[model samples]
Target: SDTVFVRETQIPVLIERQDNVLFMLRLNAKESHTLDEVVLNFGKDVNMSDIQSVKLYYSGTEARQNYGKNFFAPVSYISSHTPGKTLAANPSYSINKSQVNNPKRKVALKANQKLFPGINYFWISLQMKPDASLLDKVAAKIAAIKVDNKEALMHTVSPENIVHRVGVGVRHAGDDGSASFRIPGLVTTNKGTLLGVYDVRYNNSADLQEHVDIGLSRSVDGGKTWEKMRLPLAFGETGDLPAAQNGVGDPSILVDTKTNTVWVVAAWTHGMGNQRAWWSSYPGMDMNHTAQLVLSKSTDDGKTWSKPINITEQVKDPSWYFLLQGPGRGITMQDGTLVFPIQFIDSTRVPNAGIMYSKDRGETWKIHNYARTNTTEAQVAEVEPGVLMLNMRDNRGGSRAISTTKDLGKTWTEHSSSRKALQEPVCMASLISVKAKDNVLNKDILLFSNPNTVKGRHHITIKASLDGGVTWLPEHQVMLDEGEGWGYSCLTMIDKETIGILYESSVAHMTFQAVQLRDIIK
Candidate 1:
């Protein structure tokens, strides 16, 4: 049989005429036809010719090497460099011809990479994708010039994407970024289909909690441009007028795969003027703060809702913090277990991250203490069966912390934190899972996008992890600034390859910055 075996594990080939991705290695198992060619048809859309090389391995997985064993040689391919594309023709690109033509050993994924013939499992890693933007073009040109001139282009960065002419300085709504048709979230239904959306609030703000409105944004053409739906979640009177000086809350959304239910989670109080180190000084913050988890449901394919369900009562207050606020970004486990990362309002230390599981959709909840007074604003994704990884803002250090759970958030390891060297809690940071479910040991990819600057929101980095969430590799970044300022941002990955992010300059005076879903990992 023309079969592709992974790590000696036999993979069933597409035997018959079923499935859109049905494929087989070009061989037969008959005694008369013992000889066969084992080729892989990753997807019908993949260009096999574009693959420069394929590396095979047997000893360990990418995760085992750093992130684990199953993640061992993941499939990768290299795409040719793409020049910049802009709305206008003749985009300026400067490539040092001398550097590009300089003949030298083209850098390989790893050094002395060895491969074995019979090793069925191999990683097909993609190198540089086509950089089709002026910024990327410029960077490529610079590198080429450096190589040709025998001078090193110290650092390489993709050219800034100046194509999208969408200017930043305007707002259709008030400050808190409340939009009539923008509610960021994902949902799953009993039908087994998944839907996700990241709302875009096109406004600017310098004040805190000024124009927080929530609307249901939909992607009719597969999450490209969103059209506004009626208000889904928004700023209550308290948020409108802000009882507390710093009462600004942002919403995060997720969907349950098994039950076909959608959940939206938002931070209750916006960190404000005092930076009081505690929730004590922030009074009346929750005044318009509805006591329940504000929610809306869709039984008819999200066309209509069953009214917003305030499920805040289901949450039990963890004794460590002053008040129990909202939950973390939501994720569903392989076995239908829905996970929600939550936070507590602390009067003393930083807000902590808590874990909650709802077996019965959002009707009931189970809360567990994960991080005490040190983490908040977390998002979770299933790395493997019964295994979960959490990406969150480390309140204690204001960096990004990666945590692991064996029994589904029942207990957590101390977890590793990406320090000042990698990530800082400058704005809204998010974690996403890529590679769906091809590998078993790790099975998924962890994506954390945040401003990488230690001092401020001067840089944005998008990182990837192959071994669940054990280790990380510097993936990509969008550098913003150079100094002291407050940048509020939110991120949602609509597609595995597209990252949707919203950033604000000043929530103090109610000003917004940019709403874009740039291509981070194509």
Candidate 2:
């Protein structure tokens, strides 16, 4: 008598993977059984060209090895889909070759292997293609399974949210002798050059106590390719002081659209010893006590950069505890004013999200009052000609706070969607307003990216709002990665049609991806 059960492992991981599981099969028989082959079919919505390779694994239930009691291993092992007949502790598998003749539809793999009695597990995984389009989706599952000379079950499991293609331009945490890279600040220059700046932690992943520098990566062809890393804002180890005592990080960038010139700002902390800049720097405009605000400019797209120019006195309030740039890209108003989302702690030591604007290009600057209390990092976009929408990352868990200001944050008005529209996981998010190329409404499309979850940082999604951050429709949302990482993201329009994102991904220190407008806003 034939005795076998069929089930699917489930999912689309969104980001890159060496192997992504599709489905599993169980054979509960008295004697050994032979697996002939399996037909894996893909949906039309899935781009089959991006499926580079496929593999299969075989294991027994008793072979699993747990990670011990204190590692939180029990909960993870129990929650596994293939809990019955699966391998644990860096599971190894017996792989097979695949024949993918019709790339648009289906694939056939030869799995001429034997299964043991009691129960056996068969899991299949696939390799993702590099530099794939974000519009390309992937949906593949087991269609048919033939064991020996008998037929297997028909219905197999599939993904609820299909997978999308995500390409990695910048990879590895320690690529250029740096232990880590974090805090993304990206902007698209007037010449269409994509410029990215991040913290280059040389010693460790710590903030101010570590030896750090602001590294830059420039791309000429949108974001498909990036040039070598350059230290655009390097400061530390001045005179007899070590690099840790004079570290600078948390950078924010903006393109002076009127001049085609690029300007980058960072919070530089001096005389700091193993303490984070947030608590170590006291209330003062001087560098010896307070965290100073510094700026650097690039005249040749992003080739050459000017030295550091301190702007602490012009931007910070001496009574505040800390004044830090929001560590993302800034926006250039239609009227040629430069605006960077900034935050500072008041005399009561309460953090607030606000704005720093430069009316005269980069020559002069002024700080505004807080848009919302208990908020720190934020992003700004010109919703309308006079109205500016401040998308805030509130310290309060779950949901981002939103507000609008007409007179450059002179006063703040709570938007209707405040604290109710977008869901966040207490992380820095990205927001940019891109002009509509083809539309019936002829309004700007607000593009946003964040962890898209209320808990841990996972499910990096890009959502679009047509009518100025009011409502985010489900159809207009696109998820990039469902894996957790250091969830800080920045958005910029590479061209008229392409949207580029630079963020800390699970696969690398910093990842750059290109997305088309048709996929999300359609």
Candidate 3:
């Protein structure tokens, strides 16, 4: 039997036995936008103990001032895993008769090359060492890394700070990489407080079973800093099960102002299976469950939680994406009704984003109809009680759009092209909402994250809309990545004027980025 696999992101990952080498596609910026840094992350299966060399092949744009195109002159960067840090450094690597692409882009080796031993995971890193005094030492370190058949050149360091820009990343190969072609789904809770459901990755290490967690992080400061907490039940416990890989995902939150109770709903797998590479370090597991929705409630200002109740018990068909983050915002209607825009399907493979409603906060839920297909990594928000809108990163089509629902999520009316900027999978942020004062759209605004150009999230634009999801302006553009690929981005509104974002940068590079909401939303 033959199996067909899809590459989630088109970026290439290359690994050669112990010498796992991956070419990172980065945006090379010069004067207008400088490629300040790059970091590469590898999978957990990589053996860090085996290592031979690291090398950097450097080149640049002949013209020096292009913003909309890929790097003209390909620059080869070589780096190795330092003893304790996730940072990449230039250390001499050894190669066998097996030749691979050398930084010099010339002579290849005959045998296999050796990278680092038991390197478990890796990501690209591009930047000067923090300490300026270490320039010479850093340069020497960069020079020592091994390249197949290439000549070393003089690296350029700045005279002002003695710091130079560099690039580095992880290798992809064997059981070392993931290539799920489809890029990737919710329920509720009690207290006069509205226990809006939320999801976060608590144990998603490279080798772990990708056991995601369902929990709640509440904000007393009006969506500012959140109070971190988890759901009362585990994904697999209480027959509340999904295949382990589909532990939990797509957590959506809603706070009922009338009751001051927050309602939460989330999507998870009951018996779904996604075939992953069998690496001994991390147990290879799959999901074989129907994706179901759950509900829970919170009272007392988000200090405690109530047991979760099943809302999608009747729907045999399931739909969801394992990545749990925002864009799916819920709100209460003028009649105290609850409306949530979500993506679900009858079968695991059939995907759609639509609306769901609950008369009593999130204690229970009911499906309305299909809002969208051909779109994954979706999010929704309420512009007004009766009028709700949606935004999602369309992977099949490199763009984003906004749709509306009148009678809750029962049926989505029409969709309008909100932004045509470049986006991919879950990399770009859509689905947003602002605060309303006295039932009026406040100065507060909602925003989405994405690269302004086809360049992708590496060059991101955090754009915002003032008149609901109707219009937008470029809020800000932060360069999270400069090359070939960026993993995922999860964002939380810290305040009416600030946002906190965390995502998988390189392979194993997990970190968070914070930005001013006013800077991006205004």
lDDT of 2 by residue, 243-284 (tens): 878788998999999998899999888887788888887887
Candidate 3 residue-wise lDDT, 1-522, digit = tens: 111111112111212112223332222222122211112222333322222333222222334344334332222233222223223323322212222221221222222223222110112222222221110111111211122333222222212211121121211111112211011111122221212232344433332234555544343432212344445335654355443554555566666757867655655544433332111111111233334456556676556667765665533232333312233346676677776656543334444666666676555656666666655455666667667776765545656656787866567765555445334434445445656552133564655655445444454335666666555644343343333334444444543344544333342232223455433433
lDDT of each: 0.39, 0.75, 0.40
Model 2 TM-score relative to the real fold: 0.84
Candidate 1: worst-modelled 10 consecutive residues by lDDT: 12-21
**Candidate 1 lDDT, 24-117, residue by residue in tens:** 1111112222121122223333333322232222222222233222232333211111111111111122111111111122312221222222
Where does candidate 3 have its weakest 10-residue lDDT segment? 1-10
Q: Which ranges in model 1 have alpha carbons more than 4 Å from their true place?
A: 1-211, 235-248, 267-292, 318-328, 346-350, 408-410, 416-421, 435-443, 475-522
Candidate 3, overall lDDT? 0.40
Ranking by lDDT: 2, 3, 1
- List all candidate RMSDs to the true structure: 18.1, 5.5, 14.1
Model 3 Cα shift for residue 378 (angstroms): 2.0
